[model samples]
Target chain A: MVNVAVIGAAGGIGQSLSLLLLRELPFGSTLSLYDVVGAPGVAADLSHIDRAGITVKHAAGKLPPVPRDPALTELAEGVDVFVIVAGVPRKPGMTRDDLFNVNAGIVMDLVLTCASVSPNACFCIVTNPVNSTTPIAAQTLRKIGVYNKNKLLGVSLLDGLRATRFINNARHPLVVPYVPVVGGHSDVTIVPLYSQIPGPLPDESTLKEIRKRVQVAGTEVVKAKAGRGSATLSMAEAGARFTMHVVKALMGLDTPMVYAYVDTDGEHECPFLAMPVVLGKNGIERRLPIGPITTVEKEMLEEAVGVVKKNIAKGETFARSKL
Target chain B: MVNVAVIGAAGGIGQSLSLLLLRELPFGSTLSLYDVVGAPGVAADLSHIDRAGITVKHAAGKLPPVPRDPALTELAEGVDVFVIVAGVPRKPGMTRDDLFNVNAGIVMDLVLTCASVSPNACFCIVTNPVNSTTPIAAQTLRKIGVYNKNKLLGVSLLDGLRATRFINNARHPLVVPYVPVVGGHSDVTIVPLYSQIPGPLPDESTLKEIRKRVQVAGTEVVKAKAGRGSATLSMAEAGARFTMHVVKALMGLDTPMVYAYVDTDGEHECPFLAMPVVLGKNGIERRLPIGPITTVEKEMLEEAVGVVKKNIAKGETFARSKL
Candidate 1:
């Protein structure tokens, strides 16, 4: 049975993401949920669903207290995939980068604790600014002496989803199945490779609009909620799908290609960026080359890589101080 | 292409439910989102998903006034299924009944508006105190002179989900597939026919706790959220499933059986009660008779019917005053 655990399974995104995972996961799988608070209630709430092949476990942590609490460390054992969606979310008028200081530390501690228990487990980081938190996760894992470049991922799939949605709007009836979004998961840094479309693509102006739309979709939701919340639902969908793709690859199920931000493993100029990767039994079986792109796209990617380097450095700096 | 419109697509439950529909609905489907405050924002937020086959639409209504607003009436056209997850949710220390004063009028106006436009649209009511709100919906449809008993539904499937979940807790590996639930959609009116399980059931004491747990599962989420919110995720899942079952049947794709609080149509003692029904191209194809039950279960059913009758009357009374 495949085992999947959600590290922050009780927050706005976590609750819904956990629900989707329970509904969609292959039967006979174990779904472990954890959060600083309300984990048990979320687990209890989800436990009422009669989905099969899933054993539900949850542990609540003390607020403002120790890391690696017995509750989490104990449940962290034997996990196949860990989806980290914990941390404070973006509020209205807030950029994801605004969440860096709080989420980075949260991501570091949880990644360190869980990676120590199940070093082989694929870690799909859903905390924002994922551009930074993902690197923080890698540094923490490295500090614990169990870092696996192939198994670590930052969920940049939301960028891809946004690109796909925007691209299709221009060509509705002829919806494109794949929209490759790479670079970083932030404003201006996100780059959707419209030139990669197999056939006639949207005009440059329209394509540019699509790229900009994908970048600010999070803000759209925040403003929509009138400051009540941010983009939990869409992010949850992106995070859960990314985690499932990782789980399928680890379980030897159908091998699927998905986009995620992760360590380049010295394969490219950037250390960690969102790129298309072929997933298989050993996490990322192959980091596929970013296919052809126009000069404008290349210029965008270069700018993104610069911002990403700084984000990575910030995360690493935080990790070292904590370690 | 199927068209599913969510009446309150920008609310707490509406946003998540809208996200799931976009991700799961069959290709070429249309998702229309409406909320007084944030429809455009939610639409813009969700428009970024690359999930194919679902087109997104949004309409913002007037603030806090105007029953049967022009914005809603305009969207009411050509809808295949209209899911009403709008309405104020219970805060901590509040019962489902406590939501009646606010949600009853909201449900009444929305149902009347939508049913008038697409008289045959499958209406799935997810507003709380569904025991009463569903009947309120029926009276609105009835007053509209376009009420189709087969087309309207009160989403009470969450009770079944909770029941199935509680029953499986007693038998870990030997998960039972179905746990039938019927009667009203509130506190003591909810009844789970545990005797209808496929195999040897849990012992009496354990069974009693399971039944009670199913009935009070909503409170569990409320308490867990510490009064922050109620059962949005689980209820969203249940509402989505119920609506999809209706969609699949309407599309002639599959004739799945589902339970809902609907007009019993002389199939049961109560006028409107939750019961298992076979769905087909024309809404409910057949209302299945409740199977054999123990004396204890019979007593429970009897209590549920009486409560449901009163709930229906309450809704009818409210509808008459509004009409």
Candidate 2:
């Protein structure tokens, strides 16, 4: 059975993500739900579900009120797929940088714990400012001498989901097309490569609008909730879908090419940015080429790289200070 | 805005159904979650989700401990689409008939409440022994002179979902085919119509196995849980998918044919039996023909009718005792 551990399984994203996994994964899969509290209740609730072949278990109350070594180690035990959604959620009046300071530290600690206990498992970072946190995770793993570029991935499925929906709305009403979204998972850094879609592309003006919409889509939900929370349900759905795809690939099912943020060789000077990758048993088996970039897209790429440079430096500096 | 009410909103199916509606429904739809005890907490939890043009409300601790009076009226208020998943879940060593006594009373009381308040709403019953409770719901509404054949539906989406997945599994290794299941939602009554699919039907022996499998699929889950509960996650996904279809049709989208149990004018003596029907603003817009039935299917149909007749009578008897 494939062992999948969900950190923060009692929280909003964690609960929603667990439900999706429970629904989609094949029978007999071992699902381990861990949280600061209520993990046992959540596990018990899901255990009542009559899905074939899946066994649900709870690793409850593992994350302490304050970060601790034993707690994180216990949560990471025997986890083949470690999905981190355990950081603080974004609130109103919190800028991306502000959110970063709060979540970045939490993510770093979690990464350090994973590196110690389950370094061979594929790590999926779902914390905010993923463009930055992903690099931090990779750098932390590297510092600890367990960094594997292929296994450390940052989920950017939301960008892909939004791009597909937008294209569907603008083009075909009947077809639910899945578009490929490449580049990072944050504002301006995220790129939806419409040219690689199977059908006709939208006009330049429409494309510009789509890009802007995808970048700030989380804000749309934040504004809709009037700052109560960020995009939990949609994000959960996207995260779950991506996780399932990874599982499918691991099970030897040939999956379609998708994009995610991962540690790269910096061959194109786009260090720690999202790009199209083929996910399989070894996590990212191959990073697909970015096809062709238009002048507009090229300009966006330059700006994305600059932002990523600053974010990466920020994460590295934080990690060094902690050490 | 379409107002939808989910009874037993704190339960497994109720929570999943609510989340599905929140994610899939058109803008401006309103979801009301009603449970005897924890509706407010469930509603409050979902209220934090960031979705546009949807309003959510909670009616908690509304039902009397003994299930009396104006509470039901409050739960049914302004409900354009009423989905009933309220009742006692089956335990280990319990058969379908074992549940009839407990769930039958719950259905009668709830249906009567719907009859009194939201008589015009489309009633979709997800309670156990649906073949029986559907007719009970219709009879209660009919006695009050508010019965509309098109407005009352019993969800058998589980049957359809199983058939679809079964066919997908039996055929192509990768393809997930869709199947239309008709007849009833219980043992021996559930029918998987393979001929209706767009692709090639399985061989005779394979078809037989598929039919039997669909009929006993719930037992697979029940047995997996060691009789802890029936299919929750899969049932929830199926229920949510069905509810979304109804919401889509209500939003003026043309939906294809769907199978549901309802009180239909038919040559068959059974008042409520599952059959293919086109759904629209008015629940069962048109009942589709069962098409050509093989000898085995024909025999199964006869057996299903007899079982349904007994179940329906049991429900009617319960309602009569209540009155």
Candidate 3:
């Protein structure tokens, strides 16, 4: 039985993500939930679903979040995958980076606690400022002597989803399965390779507009929420989809080519970037090239790499300071 | 293309319900969202999913909810199914009837507006006390001269889900796809027929305990929420699952035999009952029998019918007073 733990399983994104996991997980899989609060409620709520063979276990941390909570360690044991989405969500008028101070610490504590117990678990990071938090997760794992570049993935699939949707909307009545996305997972850094799609392209200017829109889809939801929330349902879908791909890959079911922010391992100049990679039982099977791209996308990638370097450095610095 | 409108698309249940619909709806179908709040955010959130062929539309009503919101009429015009989950939720110590005063009016207004626009649409009521609100929905439809007994369904699938889960837990290592539930959608009025399953049976006392657990599962969630919320996530799953069955039946995909709190139409003494029905393009094609039950189950069913009668009468009284 596969055990997947959702570290922030009661928040806006966590609740729905947990629901999807409950619905989609393979038979006999266990969905473990953790949060600073409301985890039991989510567990109780999800436990009532008709889907069977999947057990739900949940625990809540103390408010103000104690470091190294044993409840999490107990829950994290035997986990095949840990989808960490624990962080304060981005509000209206806030960049993902603005969430760094709060969410960075949250991710660090969670990764440390989870990785300590399940050292072999694949980690899929979905917290905001993923450009930084993913690196934070890696550093935390490395600190715990469990760092595996292949097993750590920053969920940037949302950008690809938005890209596919925008392009499909522009193409009107012609829908493609997916659009390639590369580079970082933030504004101006999110690079969508629309040219990679085998389709009739929109005008250059229109494509550029769509690309920019893809970059700010998070903010669009934030604004549309009118300060109530940010992109929970969509982000939940992305996080859940990415985790399922990891689960399927580990189950030897299918080799899914997914885009996620991961250690470049010298494949790129930046230490970490969101690029298409083949997933398998042991984690990342192959780091595919960026493939061919238009001059516009290439330039965007260049800029994204620059921002990513700083983000990686910032996370490493925080980890070093904490150590 | 099927069009499913979620009247409470912004609420806790509506948000996740919309997400599931976005993921599960057939290609080319449209998921429309409407609420007094957060509809735009939910639409924006779900619109970003990578799934193609489904479009998301959203609109909001005023707070005091004007008698006939034009926005709803416009959005509901082409809807094939209206899944109404718009109502105040149950809190700690609150019975389903406690929500009747507030939710009954809400269901009435929504059914009136939606039925006025999409008289042919299947109405799946997820708002509670479903035992009452469902009857109120029927009354509103009747008042509008558009009542189709087969077209209105009160989602009692949550009880079935809970019942199956509870029995499975007691049976340990044995999981069943569904456990048959009959009667009403609330409290003692809800009945689970574990005897209908083709499997080993638990002891009489154990089965009795599981039955009571199924009946009070909503309250279990409310108390677990610690006075903060109700059963949104699980209810979302139930609502979405029921709506999909409705959508599939309408699409002529399959004749799914399912249980729901719906008009009995002389199938039983009660005006409405939650029992197995065959769904098809014209909504409920057939109401299956209650099947054989244990002596204890029969006793419980008798008590359930009594309470359901009063609940139905209460809802009818409210609808008549409003008229």
Which of the two, 2 or 3, has more TM-score?
Answer: 3
Q: Give the worst 10-residue stretch by lDDT in candidate 1 chain A.
A: A90-99
lDDT of 1 at B198: 76
| lDDT, candidate 2, A124-162, per-residue tens | 778877866777787778888877778877787777766
- B1-323, model 2: which lDDT tens digit per residue? 78888877776577767887777788678888877765655565565344335668766564445554565566666678888888556464545556676777777777776677666778778887677777677667878777788777777777666666556654654444456666677787777766655655657987787777777755566555445665555667777878788877877777667777877687467877777788776666677777877675677777778887887887788777776
RMSD (Cα, Å) of model 2 = 9.6
For candidate 3, write residues A95-171 as lDDT tens digits.
55567877777777777777767788887888777777776777777777767778887788777777877777777
Task: List model 3 lDDT by residue over B1-323, tens digit each.
Answer: 77888877776677777777777888889878888877777777777767677777777777777888877777876778888777665464554545667777777777787777678778777776777777677667777887778787778777777777777776777777887777876677877777777877868887677767766766667788886777777778778888888888898979888887777788688768877888877887878888778785678778778887787887788878978
DockQ-derived CAPRI band for the predicted complex in model 2? incorrect
Q: Model 1: how far is B323 from its true place, Å?
A: 5.3
Chain B TM-score of predicted candidate 3 relative to the true chain B: 0.93
Runs of candidate 1 with Cα error greater than 4 angstroms are: A92-98, A202-229, A291-294, A306-323, B90-98, B194-209, B212-221, B224-229, B267-269, B291-296, B314-323
Q: What are the models' TM-scores? A: 0.89, 0.62, 0.94
Model 1 residue A83 distance off true place after TM-score fit, in angstroms:
1.6
- List residue ranges in candidate 2 displaced over 4 A: A62-66, A69-72, A173-176, A320-323, B1-15, B18-81, B84-122, B125-144, B148-323
- How are the candidates ranked when ordered by lDDT, highest leading? 3, 1, 2
| TM-score between candidate 2 and the true structure | 0.62
